[PDB]
Design a protein around this motif. Structure first.
Motif, PDB file in Angstrom:
ATOM      1  N   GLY A 166       0.771  -0.856   0.024  1.00  0.00           N
ATOM      2  CA  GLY A 166       0.078  -0.021   0.034  1.00  0.00           C
ATOM      3  C   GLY A 166       1.132   1.586   0.374  1.00  0.00           C
TER       4      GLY A 166
ATOM      5  N   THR B 266       1.394   3.200  -2.228  1.00  0.00           N
ATOM      6  CA  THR B 266       0.856   4.070  -2.875  1.00  0.00           C
ATOM      7  C   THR B 266      -0.575   4.567  -1.967  1.00  0.00           C
ATOM      8  N   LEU B 267      -1.464   3.971  -0.919  1.00  0.00           N
ATOM      9  CA  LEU B 267      -2.172   4.680   0.082  1.00  0.00           C
ATOM     10  C   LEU B 267      -1.063   4.880   1.243  1.00  0.00           C
TER      11      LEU B 267
HETATM   12  N1  LIG Z   1      -2.070  -0.190   5.785  1.00  0.00           N
HETATM   13  C1  LIG Z   1      -3.249  -0.929   5.416  1.00  0.00           C
HETATM   14  N2  LIG Z   1      -4.575  -0.394   6.298  1.00  0.00           N
HETATM   15  C2  LIG Z   1      -5.128  -0.707   5.566  1.00  0.00           C
HETATM   16  N3  LIG Z   1      -5.426  -1.254   3.757  1.00  0.00           N
HETATM   17  C3  LIG Z   1      -4.063  -1.173   3.295  1.00  0.00           C
HETATM   18  C4  LIG Z   1      -3.183  -0.603   4.793  1.00  0.00           C
HETATM   19  N4  LIG Z   1      -1.979  -1.476   3.262  1.00  0.00           N
HETATM   20  C5  LIG Z   1      -2.383  -1.372   2.168  1.00  0.00           C
HETATM   21  N5  LIG Z   1      -3.544  -2.230   1.663  1.00  0.00           N
HETATM   22  C6  LIG Z   1      -4.695  -2.894   0.759  1.00  0.00           C
HETATM   23  O1  LIG Z   1      -4.010  -3.263   0.047  1.00  0.00           O
HETATM   24  C7  LIG Z   1      -4.279  -1.892  -1.293  1.00  0.00           C
HETATM   25  C8  LIG Z   1      -2.597  -2.299  -1.303  1.00  0.00           C
HETATM   26  O2  LIG Z   1      -2.074  -1.264  -1.518  1.00  0.00           O
HETATM   27  P1  LIG Z   1      -1.386  -0.284  -3.143  1.00  0.00           P
HETATM   28  O3  LIG Z   1      -2.411   0.119  -3.828  1.00  0.00           O
HETATM   29  O4  LIG Z   1      -0.883   0.497  -1.934  1.00  0.00           O
HETATM   30  O5  LIG Z   1      -0.019  -1.421  -3.188  1.00  0.00           O
HETATM   31  P2  LIG Z   1       1.991  -0.738  -3.930  1.00  0.00           P
HETATM   32  O6  LIG Z   1       2.284  -1.803  -3.055  1.00  0.00           O
HETATM   33  O7  LIG Z   1       1.795   0.218  -4.377  1.00  0.00           O
HETATM   34  O8  LIG Z   1       1.993  -1.991  -5.097  1.00  0.00           O
HETATM   35  P3  LIG Z   1       2.352  -1.015  -6.114  1.00  0.00           P
HETATM   36  O9  LIG Z   1       3.830  -1.972  -6.168  1.00  0.00           O
HETATM   37  O10 LIG Z   1       1.518  -2.228  -7.611  1.00  0.00           O
HETATM   38  O11 LIG Z   1       2.072   0.177  -7.008  1.00  0.00           O
HETATM   39  C9  LIG Z   1      -4.583  -1.308  -0.791  1.00  0.00           C
HETATM   40  O12 LIG Z   1      -5.788  -0.389  -1.748  1.00  0.00           O
HETATM   41  C10 LIG Z   1      -5.583  -1.475   0.712  1.00  0.00           C
HETATM   42  O13 LIG Z   1      -7.042  -1.703   0.004  1.00  0.00           O
END
Ligand SMILES: Nc1ncnc2c1ncn2[C@@H]1O[C@H](COP(=O)(O)OP(=O)(O)OP(=O)(O)O)[C@@H](O)[C@H]1O
Ligand SMILES: [Mg+2]
Lengths: 49, 385, 51, 48
Positions: free
Chosen positions: B176, B178-179
């Motif tokens: 996450g 990106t979150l």
């Molecule tokens: N800390 C958190 N608490 C709640 N849900 C979470 C959390 N971390 C991640 N998630 C869940 O998992 C999903 C995936 O995270 P995200 O889209 O940010 O991935 P990423 O690591 O940026 O991958 P990429 O390499 O494709 O960019 C989120 O949309 C959320 O639903």
């Protein structure tokens, strides 16, 4: 959507083209086989069937 | 009832009052157009005409002239004209040129682009801290770097070392990042720009860099700021074809970004968030280790972490009274929060299939089976047995 | 009379010049709009008498 | 100076004896006419 004609200087749709137009040429020679027939064959009579 | 009545009182008087005042004012303005106004508006029309071509101001030459670059292939040496001067202009701003005879006749865009619209956001982030809950230790590397100098730069001055500068979110998908970028920026209390680096890739020439340049200009106005360039991995180093190319512009864009990191003055007030899959998805040519500071390494949730994540998801999920959280955690081994998100959704799908309102524990096992399916490993007992 | 008149009116439309085709990106403050002309660049341009 | 240059294309496809699809070097595909002077026996598809 298909090819169509436009006037050169009026720049409008005056006339229509077949879609066949503006596509690949179909046999770049003449279409048919040269004097070579089932007589010339000589094969492979069954598989030609 | 009365809590309604009081709000009702205030909200009606303010809205209504305003409507009547606007409604009258449109008339009160238009009736007198005598003296100054008529003259001003008239001159502005005459110098202008119709249509007006968008332009861009590359530079000003100190003789009341300028160098401009049009959307047509040509570029042009023009005169600066009208009410807009070179003092009122600044380079890199979009400007109105008259079609027939190229001269700056005005501006109405004022450096408004379809890239500028997407980047803009001066509002607080949507996620607050621990929406984004948990990867607490990961937040306890991003916050250090990103929140802390903005809040008090003082701390670093007393410490006696240069402030932090940027962060590189890198490592595992599905954690996450990106979150997460959102979560932190809320807490600090700062403006949050967001732009996807895929839209800084252009097949037009000199356009790539113009789009990178707009970002730091905006960032400085609304400082303190945290700028999220989402996916710097997507500028990457990639190539479209090698027989008609596409791999030139990629470099020029990457380069324009490495320069304004440090080169937009040595400040931790122009923070950057670079999310990347790994560093070896980037151009390997890089700025030195302290210029980007700490690199933040995301890794797989451990057993405790994925209880947290799982728990968040299932609260939202309705009609699961036959599910107990722990037992889900027992059967599963370490995995992303990404796959927990999928398992919970696949479990609604199964229970909707069956036509039964309830969501069972049993149901969830079927969903584990589906997700784990093609991860199978028999070389695990190839070594062990 | 109806027929001869029409054949001449369609000819009149051909002789008078082309048209293009844009999409309105935004509204600007002189009573003009920012259009992006789809096959070319942008042009900022005045409203119609019906628009 | 009074003779003037000329444009090259290639016959892209025969439309008619008296109409040809040519693809201009300048740019756009055209439908052209056939001069009295050029014979249609010479004209064919794919010739310059
Ligand atoms: N800390 C958190 N608490 C709640 N849900 C979470 C959390 N971390 C991640 N998630 C869940 O998992 C999903 C995936 O995270 P995200 O889209 O940010 O991935 P990423 O690591 O940026 O991958 P990429 O390499 O494709 O960019 C989120 O949309 C959320 O639903
Ligand atoms: Mg992502």
């Amino acid at each position: 959507s298909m090819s169509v004609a436009l006037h050169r200087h009026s720049n409008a749709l005056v006339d229509i083209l077949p879609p066949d137009s503006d596509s690949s040429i179909s046999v770049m020679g003449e279409n048919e086989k040269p004097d070579v027939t089932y007589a010339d064959v000589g094969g492979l009579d069954m598989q030609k069937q | 009832t009365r809590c309604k009545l009081k709000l009702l009182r205030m909200e009606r008087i303010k809205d209504h009052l305003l409507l009547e005042e606007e409604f009258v004012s449109n008339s009160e303005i238009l009736k007198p157009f005598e003296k100054k106004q008529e003259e001003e508006k008239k001159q502005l029309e005459e110098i202008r005409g119709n249509p007006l071509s968008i332009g861009t101001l590359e530079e000003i030459i100190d003789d009341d002239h300028a160098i401009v670059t049009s959307p047509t292939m040509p570029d042009y040496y023009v005169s600066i004209l009208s009410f807009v001067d070179k003092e009122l202009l600044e380079p890199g701003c979009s400007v109105l040129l008259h079609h027939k005879t190229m001269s700056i006749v005005g501006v109405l865009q004022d450096d408004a682009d379809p890239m500028v619209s997407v980047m803009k956001m001066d509002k607080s982030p949507t996620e607050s801290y621990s929406d984004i809950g948990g990867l607490e230790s990961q937040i306890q590397e991003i916050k250090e770097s990103v929140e802390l100098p903005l809040t008090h730069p003082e701390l670093y001055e007393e410490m006696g070392i240069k402030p932090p500068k940027g962060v590189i979110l890198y490592g595992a998908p599905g954690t996450g990042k990106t979150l997460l970028a959102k979560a932190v920026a809320n807490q600090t209390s700062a403006t949050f720009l967001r732009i996807v680096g895929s839209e800084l890739i252009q097949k037009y020439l000199g356009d790539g860099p113009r789009l990178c340049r707009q970002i730091f200009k905006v960032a400085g106005e609304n400082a303190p700021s945290i700028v999220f360039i989402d996916e710097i991995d997507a500028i990457g180093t990639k190539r479209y074809d090698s027989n008609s190319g596409g791999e030139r512009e990629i470099q020029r864009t990457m380069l324009e970004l490495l320069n304004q990191l440090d080169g937009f003055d040595d400040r931790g007030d122009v923070k950057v968030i670079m999310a990347t899959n790994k560093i070896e998805t980037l151009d390997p040519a890089l700025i030195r280790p302290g210029r980007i500071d700490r690199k933040i390494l995301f890794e797989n949730p451990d057993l405790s972490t994925k209880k947290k994540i799982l728990g968040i998801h299932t609260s939202k999920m309705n009609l699961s009274e036959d599910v107990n959280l722990e037992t889900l955690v027992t059967t599963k081994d370490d995995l992303s929060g990404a796959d927990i998100q999928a398992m919970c959704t696949e479990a609604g799908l199964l229970a909707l299939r069956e036509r039964r309102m309830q969501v069972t524990a049993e149901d969830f096992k079927q969903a584990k089976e589906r997700v784990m399916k093609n991860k199978v490993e028999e070389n695990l007992e190839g070594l062990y047995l | 009379n109806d027929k001869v008149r029409f054949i001449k009116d369609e000819l009149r439309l051909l002789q008078e010049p082309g048209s293009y085709v844009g999409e309105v990106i935004k509204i600007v403050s002189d009573k003009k709009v920012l259009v992006k002309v789809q096959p070319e660049g942008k042009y900022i341009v005045d409203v119609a008498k019906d628009i | 100076l009074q003779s003037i240059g000329q444009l090259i294309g290639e016959v892209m496809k025969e439309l008619s004896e008296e109409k040809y699809i040519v693809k201009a070097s300048s740019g756009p595909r055209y439908i052209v006419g056939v001069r009295n002077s050029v014979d249609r026996s010479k004209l064919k598809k794919g010739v310059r």
